[PDB]
């Protein structure tokens, strides 16, 4: 397709639940498959390229004929271990994408710790944020930068994470109308490094948390396909868990369960949903003094664990988590829509998913206008 519907790219995302979603991606030639996590939340293109045990695959240099080394390093840390790499470039291609092959930065992973996860099937990380905070610095060109300036693909990529096995849909180049009901809503990308935005107002069950807006987005709140919870900065995430606390005070349970240091199990099929608030995040709209509001469900919220081999019952993780590094709308939001990253016009697109999981009376919801204002206070500096 060249506009509003692409079957090509439909149903291109695979996954496990709490492991990500990941598209598979050639590198070189002749092409070498691989699945790559789609994470909106870093800027490196990095593939394994070494016999990790835990991988099924990996970049192969020596295979590559179109391989080029650009002799330099890249070391990248994170608050739960790390991987480093050796640069370089090659053509990258995308089987269930648009049809083309593209000259892209790869980072060769050489090593790592806590990087890759035992029994995944993804081998690579696809960062589709900006430039600002590739590693090692703003010169190396992420992908979907290379993508733009090398074809006539426009610049825009759109994601439907569907939620052992997930789906979805990454639309390169466009939106696809099937995927979404009702209208998008566009909230402005505040700058381009994470995909930043200001959340405006919160609301549980329909009642506003009275907060400062400025601590909803301190220091950043982001759209963040590569984290699976709903993280929250921690003043706001305690006025938070303490109003779903009181919604759901028609039940009781744990401290810990609230902190995601234990996990709670209901018998199967009996999970009290209607116990449970709605959530509803304000972001700003495109027009002074305009905002919209994105609200999910319990059923983003508390996901399944799967893997509790000492349990027989329907055991849930609350994914809802507090943060130091800002608000974080991971899987927890982003599974409840269609998420337009319109990078051509510094915007991001909201709209109720297709897909989405809901029950027989709670439905995730994009709605608007509403009149907010100081909204640019919501912002930090
Ligand atoms: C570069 C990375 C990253 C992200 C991941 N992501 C996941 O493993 C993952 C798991 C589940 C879901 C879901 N749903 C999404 N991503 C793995 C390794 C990894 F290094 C680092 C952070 C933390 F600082 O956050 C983001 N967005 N990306």
């Not at 016999?51 to 179109?66: A, E, G, I, N, W």
């Not at 090398?150 to 997930?166: D, E, I, K, R, W």
């Not at 959340?199 to 709140?221: A, P, T």
């Not at 939001?333 to 709209?351: H, L, S, W």
């Amino acid at each position: 397709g060249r506009r509003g519907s692409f079957v090509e790219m439909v149903d291109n995302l695979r996954g496990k639940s709490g492991q990500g979603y990941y598209v598979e991606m050639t590198v070189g030639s002749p092409p070498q498959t691989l699945n790559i996590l789609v994470d909106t939340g870093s800027s490196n293109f990095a593939v394994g390229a070494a016999p990790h045990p835990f991988l099924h695959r990996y970049y192969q240099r020596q295979l590559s004929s179109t391989y080029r080394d650009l002799r330099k390093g890249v070391y990248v840390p994170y608050t739960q271990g790390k991987w480093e790499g050796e640069l370089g470039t090659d053509l990258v291609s995308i089987p269930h994408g648009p049809n083309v092959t593209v000259r892209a930065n790869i980072a060769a992973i050489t090593e790592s710790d806590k990087f890759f996860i035992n029994g995944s099937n993804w081998e690579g990380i696809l960062g589709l944020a900006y430039a600002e905070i590739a590693r090692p610095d703003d010169s190396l060109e992420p992908f979907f930068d290379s993508l733009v300036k090398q074809t006539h693909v426009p610049n825009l990529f759109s994601l439907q994470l569907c939620g052992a096995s997930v789906g979805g849909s990454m639309i390169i180049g466009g939106i696809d109308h099937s995927l979404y009901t009702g209208s998008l809503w566009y909230t402005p990308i505040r700058r381009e490094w994470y995909y930043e935005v200001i959340i405006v107002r919160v609301e549980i069950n329909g009642q506003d948390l009275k907060m400062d807006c400025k601590e909803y987005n301190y220091d950043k709140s982001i759209v963040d396909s590569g984290t699976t919870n709903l993280r929250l900065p921690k003043k706001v995430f305690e006025a938070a868990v303490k109003s779903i606390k009181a919604a759901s005070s028609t039940e009781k349970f744990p401290d810990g369960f609230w902190l995601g240091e234990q996990l709670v199990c209901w018998q199967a099929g009996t999970t009290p949903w209607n116990i449970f608030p709605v959530i509803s995040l304000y972001l700003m709209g495109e027009v002074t003094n305009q905002s919209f509001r994105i609200t999910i469900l319990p059923q983003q919220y508390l996901r399944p664990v799967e893997d509790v081999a000492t349990s027989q019952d329907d055991c849930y993780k609350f994914a809802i988590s507090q943060s130091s590094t800002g608000t974080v709308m991971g899987a927890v939001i982003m599974e409840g829509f269609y998420v337009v990253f319109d990078r051509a016009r510094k915007r991001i697109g909201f709209a109720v998913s297709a897909c989405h999981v809901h029950d027989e009376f709670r439905t995730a919801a994009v709605e608007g206008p509403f009149v907010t204002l100081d909204m640019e206070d919501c912002g930090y500096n």
